[model samples]
Target: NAIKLNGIENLKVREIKGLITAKILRAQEMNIPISIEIPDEVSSINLNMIDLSRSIGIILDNAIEASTEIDDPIIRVAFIESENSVTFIVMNKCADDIPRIHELFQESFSLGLSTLKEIADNADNVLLDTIIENGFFIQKVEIINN
Candidate 1:
């Protein structure tokens, strides 16, 4: 049993491409540089695009929100593959008035971590939890299965 999308379902390959094109176009229209790529090295694979997109979206959204309050905003997204997994890093340069962001991700002293915990509570599946830090970089990794 599968749920139906009463109208404008995007299950077709053509529709999916059209959606991606639209997203790229919108980003370009706003003068935002975005890169989307599909891997060619893998002959076959099994991964959940929806979940990956969700994790990326949450991080990107937060970055954008933080960038808005900065005068010199710099944001970069990187995807690197390791032997066992791939890691996605969202790097943002802190603004002049903004406090050091490295501390925000620290589980030990973070007051805002409660918000993340609250969101996780509603989800039944949490394969990997967030790891807070006190450094310049915060990384999220996705393990590949054979």
Candidate 2:
């Protein structure tokens, strides 16, 4: 049944915020305070979800890892939605000497680096940015929807 005449197959549909909540639970299990804020309008939209949940899971895992080394750790996840795009943002407090953004995204630094990069590449429109500001390390990944 998976064989299709159009050659498009194995696509998965998922409620965006629901999937994010599931991933957030994984982070909470680390005994850290975490918060997620996603609007109902954005959460209700289902997409051809592929590596999205996986990518978020990986990012949250890294955030939790980094948070473990900081005092008063907290992780936050948010979604910024537009008419035709959405940006996923994750922020967590970290040590003053957090690793450089480029270094963490390097292929050798993260086991999921290839998957993360591939997810961005396959997105119709994507932008990934990371920064350490004040006492938090933040990551934002955006993708377009038509």
Candidate 3:
């Protein structure tokens, strides 16, 4: 009860890294075996901090839920940087093999996942991708900063 991903009041582009650590701290404190990989420092990019924070929180929120009931649960979080964009990769141990891609984004599909597409559409240069590989449920939120 003391720990939950609460809504952010505000965030600065430079401060999101710290904010991210705060979000995942909830999972770390809950005793989940989680590994987070992020750059030592990040370069600022234009983004809607409020909306972006919520979207990221939800993704991690979703991962924590999926990790709770499985044997040897694992959560590997990576914030990747490439020439064109920065991507958030959230991978968790999955029980189900995989769900059809079409079924995932439908209005009647997953509770939190279905809203991902909507959030990305409302933001600038954001791309959403979800897949299952090597028995892991992976969600990637890529922000293209031009």
Candidate 4:
């Protein structure tokens, strides 16, 4: 059974594609190649577009910066959905010697991320998970829709 969460808005199904395209274009401009993997079946999700936009932009910005450190920068973007949740993931090339996960939570990892403090830690019941492995920094934002 699906449950509704109050005080948070769902992203309009129509706006999802636009948001992804915008973020991807921003990455392309910076000379970082990106790969996108979206699901075949989609719907309006339980995440806020505004917050999600920043989440995407900031994550992509962070990803872009990290990618630049490698010889051939590669970034992968994907949208995954489970029974009651949706996750936005961004992974990019990174140096073997990079900041640890503990340091990444710094929030001030980069400029412009001077984002509103609460949004990163607590936004629309979203959970942000990150990992660094095999010369890649992977960041995920999973939205709990129900």
Candidate 5:
């Protein structure tokens, strides 16, 4: 069955890990080269197993769909915990024309899936801060010099 993460707390460790795991499975299923990393301490946290599994599955599904047709495809997911919260980051390799990551918010710019605005409601509390091409914080090295 598809991932069902409704009502999951966004800051919980289980939720965070689930999302990253889902992204990894997607990469593998799509034959995309990928890696995943979660600090031992953070990964050891106690959380709802069902919710964690669901969230991870959803993330993987999304990542797979995005990286499907790329050559030398790679998607990486990581989970980290701060003093009080956890964060999940997933990066997927894509082509130059694959739309700026921020553009995923605009009413236009479809990245081979349903409009983010439309589906975001179901995935509430998932704050997506756009750091793409921000220059100040260069990340997703795979996206650089593409």
Candidate 6:
């Protein structure tokens, strides 16, 4: 399935390493330390490079910002490839507790996701999941390619 999010055009299926690298660099520039571990076997498909990068950037930005309250801020980025889909995950140290899942679906969270609304809206299919635990927050984006 090839879905299109409004305002996004010229979709392309591409590997994510390079695009993810760019976002990592931006995170580092913001004084947020990030480590990337993407397996050579996994890749992103049926997505626009620009939007994907921006979405990742937004996540990283938030991760970094949330981590500042703590003594040490750590950001981790990983890509996992499975039989039918690929998962992009970002984890960071957080000082505050995320009380409920709905908190992430609120306007603030939507605003963050909206940064790449066009890309997400246009994706063939997208699933976003999050976890808050042990003084850390994790965001996972799973993409099922067409």
Best by lDDT: 3
lDDT of 2 at 128: 69
Using TM-score as the yardstick, the better of models 1 and 3 is 3
Q: Rate residue 67 of model 6 by lDDT.
A: 61
RMSD of 1: 10.2
How do the predictions measure up, each by TM-score? 0.47, 0.72, 0.75, 0.74, 0.51, 0.67
lDDT of 3 by residue, 1-146 (tens): 23232222222355566767775677777666676666533465445777677778778877777666666667787776677777878888875634432344453263577677788878768888888778788899998878
Each model's backbone clash number: 0, 0, 0, 0, 4, 5
Output the lDDT of residue 126, model 2.
71
Model 5: weakest 10-residue lDDT segment is: 137-146
Instruction: Give, for candidate 3, the lowest lDDT window spanning 10 residues.
Output: 3-12
* Candidate 4 or 2, higher TM-score: 4
Of 3 and 4, the candidate ranking higher by lDDT? 3
Per-residue error for 48 in candidate 1, Å, reads 1.5
Q: Using alpha carbons, what is the TM-score of model 3?
A: 0.75
Task: Assess candidate 4 and give its TM-score to the true structure.
Answer: 0.74
Write the residue-wise lDDT of candidate 6 on 26-59 in tens digits. Answer: 6666667776655545434445666666777777
Candidate 1 C-alpha lDDT tens digits along 34-88: 4433332322223355544445555555454445455545445544444654445
lDDT of each: 0.42, 0.63, 0.68, 0.67, 0.45, 0.62
Better of 2 and 3 by lDDT: 3
Q: What would the per-residue lDDT of candidate 5 be over residues 123-144, giving only the tens digit for each residue?
A: 4433333243311111210111
- Candidate 5 overall lDDT versus native: 0.45
lDDT accuracy of residue 79 in candidate 3? 70
TM-score order, best first, reads: 3, 4, 2, 6, 5, 1
At residue 120, candidate 5 shows an lDDT of: 36
> What is the lDDT for 121 in model 1?
50
Report how far off residue 75 is in candidate 2 (Å).
0.4
- Which residue pairs collide in model 3, if any? none
